[PDB]
Amino acid sequence: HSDLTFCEIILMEMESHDAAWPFLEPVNPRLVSGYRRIIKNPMDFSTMRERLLRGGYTSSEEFAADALLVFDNCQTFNEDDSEVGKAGHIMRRFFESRWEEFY
Numbered sequence: 001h002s003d004l005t006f007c008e009i010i011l012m013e014m015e016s017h018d019a020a021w022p023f024l025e026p027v028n029p030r031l032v033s034g035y036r037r038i039i040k041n042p043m044d045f046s047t048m049r050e051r052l053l054r055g056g057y058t059s060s061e062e063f064a065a066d067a068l069l070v071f072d073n074c075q076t077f078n079e080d081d082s083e084v085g086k087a088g089h090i091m092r093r094f095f096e097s098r099w100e101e102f103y
């Protein structure tokens with residue numbers, strides 16, 4: 001559980017990141033046309049936060065799966081040169097970097 005301690009570390013670092021603004025809260029399908037249709041399994045940092053505090057992560061691979069899901073959804077719905085897309089690539093590279101330099 002140096003595992004789940006690190007998950008707390010990297011989640012907090014992601015939550016406080018400059019490019020984290022599109023992923024702090026769940027996407028509002030009422031405000032974003034087509035998101036409900038295109039993204040099957042929505043995921044964000046607050047949802048990951050809620051599950052983490054309540055100990056809902058069996059292990060670190062489950063945590064990583066949700067994090068990558070956030071960035072997979074981002075690249076699926078948003079253009080790479082869009083403001084959200086650009087922020088997503090920064091966050092995705094940040095996660096993979098910090099995650100790997102530990103594991």
Ligand SMILES: CCC(=O)c1c[nH]c(C(=O)OC)c1
Nearest residue numbers: 022023027031032074077084
């Ligand atoms: C219309 C705004 C929009 O397309 C959008 C807002 N948030 C996202 C998103 O995918 O953030 C995760 C897309």
